[PDB]
């Protein structure tokens, strides 16, 4: 048999850390930091009610696995003498005597965790002595599957076989104490990592080459340009399908996604290597896709890509769910096996999800993720509208609280997703209609009495972006931009006064038609393959070697100087990119009243009117009756100039195009971009330092910080092809021609904008981070991710700022 | 024979006074004042080298005229004993013994200046004793023909016939001392007169009656109205003759004076009684008069009127020349005798005139006043141009220094009379042409290089009167009032560039024609007898008795209250009083350029133009190219409204008349005056005090001071008959009609003027001075002008302010 056991119980619980200094409330520290406090924290578990059962269980595991597991075939083990002295003084010790009794008639040897060479004859009671004086158990760390601080104990000086074994480890890599940390991880956070990762002949310096730096720097610009071009063609290949769709035939956001699915793959195989099959599979995982693929097929195939994307999420706690992914995917050859194993594990997965408050609302989702084998991501998204909208609203609110600079975009996004039906895009709907009824339609999202005056999303975005930049013409926006059924459809008012559905009354299809026309033009006239082909990113030098200097904990670029010329060719923005937007404006012929209100019936002209009526006209004085004959023809000629048959569409056509709208050809180019602009990535003595993912990962890149990315936008010509007024029937023609004057003002302001907002020799500085990947997804900078010294913890908090394991002190 | 004479020489000289206190340098004091200083001043003559011959001459005159003139027929006079003791102590005395020896054999009596009853037989030496102790000779005054202080001496206590004769006068009324005063006159100046002239039963109170006061007060208003009406008809009877004269036929200022001569008489027989023949004779004393009358005929006939007018002149010294007028006119029955006596007296008159510096320049004038018997006043005036212009300039300069309030009228008068040829009006000339070439013609009165830019008299008067009241429209006056050949004929420029005498070039007859047309209209349409007949001065109460209260040195009106209603009827100021003045303005069709300069090319509009061009247009801001399309039609419509064929005459016709000038009838009434205004001469306890002429005169009036002369101008209606625009071809017609607006402005401003400048219930206070004359020029208030107590000296200086007969002390 084996030795007697008394308290072999081993179950226990983990611990957690407390905030210190003025650090964020979410503490996710790494190892070190509490270098001295680890012993003190382990002493608490060493001197509590859970201490001696854990110690006895560890002793039992040691005396079975390490003592008689290679034995007991010919040597029975007994423990006649065995005692412990774990006292209240937090000082532990032991004294064990082991007898090996052999019943076989032969000569054998004892295998013990030491260089022991002892010969024992048959029927002989071999002696074994394990002595431990009263001493403080030392603390060493272990790496849990979650990469958390699994505190373990070791003996300092204990005698085995009568000799002292210095630095004795009591079955390392696993202890029956379960004293983990919920907020402290094994490894080096962000900066203790940049002590053994860079240097003279250390990891980063010997794994990053000058030719590699040059090729990655060039490929950074090349891939940025390529993804920009693929994005531009994508909206321009899907936009063409959107626009060309016939009226009354629904075309969902995802049915068109298939028609450009490969492009997405290309796009996402250039943003991140290996992320090519995942997105092309994702946009095919819907009922509207031509070839449906299940969620399990989506997940098992590109498991590694999903792992990288999850590790790129900002939330640390996801890594806790990421520790079982490798165990989840072990021994699986097809998606059916993965589905079966997830069904097997559901009995433990779903209670953990339900018990977690953060994922408590998520509980239904994962539910059918284990209930139906034909799950589709986008079908789930369109079916679980409420929960997904809730998380999206929370995430967007957090982003607003974190990104005040893009507050308008987050505001319009939140207003969009305030409606559950906004998730009907990812389903069986009409995108060219859903985007119109979400972004260009009044909202009534309330139930108290009525808040239907909430207007549309585009109108609110214009109000935010034109807050106070323009004031007098704001009334114009009130009469032509804020009060048009093509941008503010006025929900629930169509069936209020007509109740007969006239052709003009139904503005839901006229606005959809205008949006389809705009999509047609942006698709096959502006962002077409032919029009986007004349934008060439040509290398200029691309020859200089990017020498690297290494000296102690540093890695610098000697002289980075690469320049790429983006030649815009002749990017003809044809008439129709802005002619369709003109057609979005109402075609109401009532131009006299609106212009009269804007010019004369205002807040400043009326004050001058009154002041000149009561008194004024300096030098004259006594001629006060002349005044209501002076500011009456001044208004009269201006009013009479306005053509009775011209709307704001025609006025804006005169202002922008010059010639009248009916006489302006849609094939002509409104704006032509010619020439080229330079990109001048440069720098001297630029530091190169490791760049990690959001969570703990074995894949690492490198970043060059302080790269002067000069975008010299000069040498480009943004020319208005129609720089002269060719109109024959101007809206405000006459001796007080204002449409021509407005057109000249527009041309001058366009030249000013292209001189200041456009080319200005932009100067930027940032960090070029490249996570370069090899051919078969064997990225050059991959760490051992095994020993607790290269396990980087990017989300951890650095001890340099100051963290202590105590309650606010 | 008579008594022996030793120093009968009597010739001597006068004296003069010296300034004292802070009195004006021209001292012309009256008697009294130097009440105590007269004795001291006479002592100087009593103790000088001229004393004893004067005393001896006085003694001789006394002993011939008063002693033996009624004797020597039977009583020879001898002076065996005779001595004087006029010592250096200024104490005079005498001792005389007279023997009367009769050679006739009869009994006679001696006639002496005393109650002496003595009987002397024949051949008897009658004795006479005249004793005088050493005593100071007292001083008494005498009245010279010039009414100056003729100091005379008297003896206090001397014994005649053995008895003392108290207050002995040594031949009064004449002394051989000739100690006159050049600055002190006998009598009471202005206020010592109002001590014996008013009182309880003294002169003014007993010579002024309540009915007399009432009738004179009523006649004051009646005569003021009558002279105003006669003046208005006079220019309107002479103006008609001026206007109706044919072109090229000269009509002098005096040839027309005859055609209205009687009116002048009427006028001047209402301004001052008896001044009716003088002015009617004066304006007939010229070569241009139909019936010439000599200066002697003009002077001898109305000698009394000339005396009153000369006594009304402000200069005191003229009275010295007035002392011989009565002696001049003694024993003369016709103008021939007066001419003969002036020729006789010329040998003394002309040296006195020449020796006097003030009349030294006058010497030629009086010269022919005694050289030709056919002298004419106006022929002399037009012949002695230089001297008369010199005195007129000096008098006008003095009036300017004395009357700053009417400085503009004196300035234009001085500018007029700066030319000698300005006196050609009173001769053989053309008034309708001379007044045009003097008042509406440029002046070049200088010889240095050129001052021809002096402009005309009317232009300078407008510049003075429109100094800074209007500024912006001043440029209009520069282009239409300051630069018109009808008001600024531009002398010496007509024969500069043309040299061919075109019809338009000769502006001397076109301007004369315009002036003649204006005279025609003011003569027979506005100031005609028919039009002036409808202005009636009606008494309202004229019944209340003006009771007078007398109490010591006072005379007050108990309650003066008279009111006269001047009913203006319908005084039709026809079209032509202002239509002719419109025709004076140039008829140049260039109205666009002048109005453009006045309105747009100014000093304030251009600044606003520039400010709005550089920046501005509040609320818009970025629209700066619109501005040179905004302030271009604002000007363009205003410029295009102005009719190309309309001049400033037409614009002013639209502004004033309404309807166009060609369609405005000259017989219509531009302004009609209707209703009536009240004159409310009133007051309680109003002082009545004597009022004298400028110089010493026996004719006196009385003045009521403090009369509240309320001219309640209310209840009159000055109506514009054309208060609505009836024009069919306005100068600035269109949608920016400004001629109609200008006309409405003119109508409103006319109503405002007639509400404030016109009727306002004017309140005035003054002194009603009446020099009432009886039927045969026997004015009621005439003083004895004989005794040295009623001889008023109005020009004298009152001793109350302080005057002493010493050099500045």
Contact assessment for residue A738 and residue B629, using Cβ atoms and an 8 Å cutoff = yes
CB-closest option in A602, A619, A749 to B471: A619
Give CA–CA dist A532/A240, Å, rounded.
14
CB-closest option in B623, B629, B734 to A737: B629
Subunit contact B625:A745, Cβ cutoff 8 A? yes
Subunit contact B619:A735, Cβ cutoff 8 A? no
CB-count exposure of residue A461 (10 Å: 0-12, 13-18, 19+): middle
Token readout for B611 is 């400010």
Token readout for B276 is 């009716």
Give CA–CA dist B692/B770, Å, rounded.
10
CB atoms within 10 A of CB B531: 21
Give CA–CA dist A586/A583, Å, rounded.
7
Give CA–CA dist B662/B110, Å, rounded.
103
Residues of A with Cβ-Cβ distance to B471 under 8 angstroms: 619
- Looking at residue A246, the DSSP 8-state letter turns out to be P
CB-closest option in B471, B602, B742 to A626: B742
Q: Is B734 on the interface with A (CB under 8 A)?
A: yes
- Beta-carbon contacts of residue A284 (< 8 Å; ≥ 6 apart): A258, A261, A290, A291, A292, A293
Contact assessment for residue A186 and residue A173, using Cβ atoms and an 8 Å cutoff = no
A792 beta partners: A188
Give the DSSP H/E element, type plus range, for residue B598.
Answer: helix B592-599
Q: Phi/psi at A207 (nearest 5 deg)?
A: -105, 0
Give CA–CA dist B596/B598, Å, rounded.
5
CB burial of A755-784 (b: ≥16 within 10 Å; e: otherwise) equals: eeebbeeeeeeeebebbbbeeeeeebbebe
Token readout for A775 is 């051919």
If we measure between CA atoms, which residue out of B348, B418, B425 comes closest to residue B386?
Answer: B418
Give CA–CA dist B213/B227, Å, rounded.
21
Q: Phi/psi at A91 (nearest 5 deg)?
A: -120, 120
The Cα-based distances of A691 to A33, A186, A559, B498 in angstroms read: 21, 19, 21, 100
CB-count exposure of residue A326 (10 Å: 0-12, 13-18, 19+): exposed
Give CA–CA dist A356/A333, Å, rounded.
31
CB-closest option in A472, A622, A634 to B634: A634
Question: Closest-CA residue in chain A for B748?
Answer: A625
Give CA–CA dist A18/A803, Å, rounded.
9
Helix A633-641 to helix B633-641 angle, to the nearest 10 degrees?
A: 110
Give CA–CA dist A252/A241, Å, rounded.
11
Q: Is B742 on the interface with A (CB under 8 A)?
A: yes
Residues of A with Cβ-Cβ distance to B633 under 8 angstroms: 637-638, 735-736
Length of chain A: 809
Give CA–CA dist A520/A496, Å, rounded.
33
Residues of B with Cβ-Cβ distance to A471 under 8 angstroms: 619
Give CA–CA dist B556/B704, Å, rounded.
8
If we measure between CA atoms, which residue out of A702, A705, A699, A786 comes closest to residue A275?
Answer: A699
How far, rounded to the nearest angstrom, does the alpha carbon of residue A697 sit from its chain's CA centroid?
17
**3 state DSSP class of A755:** helix
- Looking at residue A768, the DSSP 8-state letter turns out to be E
Resolution in A: 3.3
Tell which residues of chain A come right before a gap with C–N over 2.5 A.
none
If we measure between CA atoms, which residue out of B783, B792, B770 comes closest to residue B702?
Answer: B770
- Beta-carbon contacts of residue B688 (< 8 Å; ≥ 6 apart): B198, B204, B208, B213, B548, B555, B556, B557, B702, B703, B704, B705
Contact assessment for residue A149 and residue A139, using Cβ atoms and an 8 Å cutoff = no
* Bridge pairing between strands B701-712 and B716-720: unpaired
Question: Closest-CA residue in chain A for B733?
Answer: A629
- Beta-carbon contacts of residue A4 (< 8 Å; ≥ 6 apart): A79, A82
SS (H, E, C) B215-274: HHHHHHHHHHHHHHHHHHHHCCCHHHHHHHCCCCCCCCCCHHHHHCHHHHHHHHHHHCCC
CB atoms within 10 A of CB A133: 15
Q: Which long-range contacts (CB under 8 A, 24 or more apart) does B682-686 make?
A: B682/B560, B682/B561, B682/B562, B682/B707, B682/B708, B682/B710, B683/B557, B683/B559, B683/B560, B683/B561, B683/B707, B683/B708, B684/B557, B684/B558, B684/B559, B684/B560, B685/B556, B685/B557, B685/B558, B686/B556, B686/B557, B686/B560
Separation in Å, CA of B599 to nearest CA in chain A: 10
Contact assessment for residue B666 and residue B579, using Cβ atoms and an 8 Å cutoff = yes
Give CA–CA dist A75/B326, Å, rounded.
190
- Beta-carbon contacts of residue B406 (< 8 Å; ≥ 6 apart): none
If we measure between CA atoms, which residue out of A637, A623, A631 comes closest to residue A606?
Answer: A631
Give the DSSP H/E element, type plus range, for residue B565.
Answer: strand B564-567
Max CA pair span of chain B = 143
Separation in Å, CA of B472 to nearest CA in chain A: 5
- Beta-carbon contacts of residue B248 (< 8 Å; ≥ 6 apart): none
Contact assessment for residue B676 and residue B568, using Cβ atoms and an 8 Å cutoff = yes
CA torsion sign, A65 to A70 to A76 to A78? negative
Phi-psi region of A323 (alpha: psi -120 to 50; beta: other; left: phi over 0): alpha
Give CA–CA dist B542/B539, Å, rounded.
6
Q: Phi/psi at A299 (nearest 5 deg)?
A: -95, -50
Residues of A with Cβ-Cβ distance to B742 under 8 angstroms: 623, 626
Token readout for A529 is 């393959």
Token readout for A722 is 């129609």
Contact assessment for residue A137 and residue A44, using Cβ atoms and an 8 Å cutoff = no
Q: Which of residues 583-622 of A touch B (CB under 8 A)?
A: 602, 604, 618-620, 622
- Looking at residue A38, the DSSP 8-state letter turns out to be H
CB burial of B577-611 (b: ≥16 within 10 Å; e: otherwise) equals: bbbbebbbbbeeeebbebbeebbeebeebeeebee
Q: Which long-range contacts (CB under 8 A, 24 or more apart) does B222-230 make?
A: B222/B537, B222/B564, B223/B270, B223/B271, B225/B537, B225/B564, B225/B566, B226/B270, B227/B267, B227/B270, B227/B271, B229/B532, B229/B535, B230/B263, B230/B266, B230/B267, B230/B270
CB burial of B676-686 (b: ≥16 within 10 Å; e: otherwise) equals: bbbbbbebeeb
Subunit contact A620:B472, Cβ cutoff 8 A? yes
If we measure between CA atoms, which residue out of B232, B227, B314 comes closest to residue B271?
Answer: B227
CB-count exposure of residue A551 (10 Å: 0-12, 13-18, 19+): exposed
* Bridge pairing between strands B163-169 and B152-160: antiparallel
Q: Is A757 on the interface with B (CB under 8 A)?
A: no
Give CA–CA dist A44/A58, Å, rounded.
18
- Looking at residue B802, the DSSP 8-state letter turns out to be -
Contact assessment for residue A329 and residue A340, using Cβ atoms and an 8 Å cutoff = no
Length of chain B: 809
CB atoms within 10 A of CB B799: 18
Token readout for B112 is 């002496």
Q: Is A5 on the interface with B (CB under 8 A)?
A: no
Give CA–CA dist B460/B412, Å, rounded.
8
**3 state DSSP class of B199:** coil
Give CA–CA dist B556/B207, Å, rounded.
14
Give CA–CA dist B223/B369, Å, rounded.
36
Give CA–CA dist A306/A295, Å, rounded.
12
Give CA–CA dist A324/A328, Å, rounded.
6
Contact assessment for residue B691 and residue B771, using Cβ atoms and an 8 Å cutoff = yes
- Beta-carbon contacts of residue A100 (< 8 Å; ≥ 6 apart): A71, A75, A76, A77, A110, A120, A125, A126, A127, A128
CB atoms within 10 A of CB B504: 8
Separation in Å, CA of A471 to nearest CA in chain B: 6
If we measure between CA atoms, which residue out of A59, A66, A71, A61 comes closest to residue A120?
Answer: A71
């Amino acid at each position: 048999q084996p030795a007697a056991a008394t308290r072999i119980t081993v179950e226990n619980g983990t611990d957690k850390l407390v905030n210190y200094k003025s650090s964020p409330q979410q503490l996710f520290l790494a190892k070190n930091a509490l270098k001295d406090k680890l012993q003190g924290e382990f002493d608490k578990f060493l001197s509590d009610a859970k201490a001696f059962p854990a110690l006895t269980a560890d002793l039992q595991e040691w005396v079975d696995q390490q003592l008689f597991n290679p034995n007991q075939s010919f040597f029975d083990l007994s423990a006649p003498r065995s005692n412990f002295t774990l006292s209240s003084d937090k000082k532990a010790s032991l004294d064990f005597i082991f007898r090996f009794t052999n019943f076989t008639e032969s000569v054998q040897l004892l295998k013990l965790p030491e260089g022991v060479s002892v010969v024992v004859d048959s029927k002989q009671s071999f002696d074994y002595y394990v002595n431990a004086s009263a001493q403080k158990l030392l603390v060493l760390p272990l790496s849990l599957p979650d990469y958390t601080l699994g505190l373990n104990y070791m003996f300092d000086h204990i005698t085995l076989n009568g000799k002292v074994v210095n630095k004795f480890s009591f079955n390392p890599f696993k202890t029956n104490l379960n004293l983990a940390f919920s907020n402290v991880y094994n490894g080096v956070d962000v900066f203790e990592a940049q002590k053994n990762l860079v240097g003279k002949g250390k990891y980063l310096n010997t794994h990053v080459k000058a030719e590699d730096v040059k090729k990655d720097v060039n490929a950074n610009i090349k891939n940025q340009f390529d993804i920009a071009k693929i994005i531009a063609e994508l909206m321009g290949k899907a936009l063409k399908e959107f626009g060309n769709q016939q009226e009354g035939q629904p075309l969902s956001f995802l049915k068109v996604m298939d028609k450009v699915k490969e492009d997405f793959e290309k796009l996402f195989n250039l943003v991140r290597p290996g992320l090519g099959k995942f997105v092309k599979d994702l946009i095919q995982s819907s009922s509207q896709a031509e070839n449906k693929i299940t969620v399990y097929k989506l997940i098992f195939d590109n498991k590694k890509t999903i792992l990288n994307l999850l590790k790129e999420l900002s939330i640390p706690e996801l890594n806790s769910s990421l520790g079982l992914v490798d165990v989840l995917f072990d021994g699986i050859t097809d998606s059916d096996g993965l589905y079966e194993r997830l069904q097997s594990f559901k009995d433990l997965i779903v209670p953990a999800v339900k018990t977690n408050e953060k994922t408590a609302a998520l509980s239904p989702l994962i539910e059918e993720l284990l209930t139906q084998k034909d799950t589709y991501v986008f079908d789930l998204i369109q079916k679980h509208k409420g929960i997904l909208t809730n998380l999206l609203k929370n995430f967007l609110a957090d982003f607003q609280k974190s990104t005040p600079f893009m507050a308008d975009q987050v505001a319009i996004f939140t207003e969009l997703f305030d409606n559950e039906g906004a998730f009907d895009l990812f389903g069986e709907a009409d995108f060219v209609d859903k985007i119109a009824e979400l972004f260009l339609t009044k909202r009534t999202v309330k139930n108290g009495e009525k808040i239907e005056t909430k207007d549309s999303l585009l109108v609110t975005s214009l109000k935010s972006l034109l807050g106070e930049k323009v004031a007098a013409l704001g009334d114009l926006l009130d009469s032509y931009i804020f009060k048009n059924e093509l941008l503010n459809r006025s929900v629930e008012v169509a069936k209020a006064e007509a109740k007969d559905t006239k052709g003009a009354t139904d503005y839901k299809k006229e606005q959809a038609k205008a949006l389809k026309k705009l999509f047609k033009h942006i698709g096959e006239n502006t962002l077409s393959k032919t029009n986007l082909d004349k934008i060439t990113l040509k290398e200029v030098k691309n020859t200089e070697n990017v020498e690297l200097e290494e000296t102690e904990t540093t890695l610098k670029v000697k002289k980075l100087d690469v320049e790429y010329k983006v030649e815009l060719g002749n990017f003809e923005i044809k008439n129709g990119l802005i002619k369709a937007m003109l057609e979005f404006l109402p075609d109401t012929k009532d131009l006299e009243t609106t212009l009269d209100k804007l010019l004369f019936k205002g807040e400043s002209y009326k004050a001058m009117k009154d002041k000149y009526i009561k008194e004024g006209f300096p030098g004259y004085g006594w001629a006060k009756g002349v005044v209501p004959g002076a500011f009456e023809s001044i208004e009269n000629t201006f009013k009479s100039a306005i053509d009775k048959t011209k709307s704001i569409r025609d006025l804006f056509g005169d202002m922008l195009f010059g010639n009248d709208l009916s006489s302006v050809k849609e094939t002509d180019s409104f704006i032509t971009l010619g020439g080229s602009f330079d990109i001048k990535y440069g720098g001297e003595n630029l530091n190169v330092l490791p760049a990690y993912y959001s969570l703990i990962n074995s894949e690492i890149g490198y970043q060059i910080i302080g790269v002067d990315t000069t975008i010299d936008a000069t040498k480009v010509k943004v020319e208005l092809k129609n720089k002269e007024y060719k109109g024959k029937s101007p809206a405000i023609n006459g001796q007080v021609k204002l449409s021509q004057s407005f057109f000249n003002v527009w041309t001058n302001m366009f030249d000013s904008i292209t001189k200041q907002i456009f080319q200005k020799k932009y100067e930027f500085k940032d960090n070029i981070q490249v996570f370069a990947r090899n051919e078969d997804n064997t990225s050059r900078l991959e760490l051992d991710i095994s020993d607790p010294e290269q396990r980087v913890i990017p989300f951890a908090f650095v001890d340099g700022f100051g963290i202590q394991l105590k309650a606010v002190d």
